[PDB]
Structure formats: C-alpha cells, structure tokens
Design a protein around this ligand. Structure first.
Ligand SMILES: *[C@@H]1O[C@H](CO)[C@@H](O)[C@H](O)[C@H]1O
Length: 36
C-alpha cells in the first residue's frame, strides 16, 4: 500500500498503486501520480 507522497501509479508504474486509507491517488501528470 503506497504511503503518502508516494507514486500511486502513473503510466507504466506497476508498483504500489493503492494508497494508504486516507490518502488518495492524485494523478498529477500522465506518469506522475501521488498519494495525497
Ligand atoms: C510510501 O510507501 C511506499 C511503500 O509502501 C514507498 O515505496 C514510497 O516511496 C513511500 O512514499
């Protein structure tokens, strides 16, 4: 589970995609998404 400020899954990012409860995956850019 992706911690706060971690990359939650942009294009190609097959790592931790689900953010910690309370943090939401914010797709900031096509490849950069951050759990906020
Ligand atoms: C949030 O936590 C993940 C591991 O769960 C780590 O890879 C991230 O870098 C961190 O921000």
């Amino acid at each position: 589970t992706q911690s706060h400020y971690g990359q939650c899954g942009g294009i190609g990012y097959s790592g931790p995609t689900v953010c910690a409860s309370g943090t939401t995956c914010q797709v900031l850019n096509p490849y950069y998404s951050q759990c906020l």
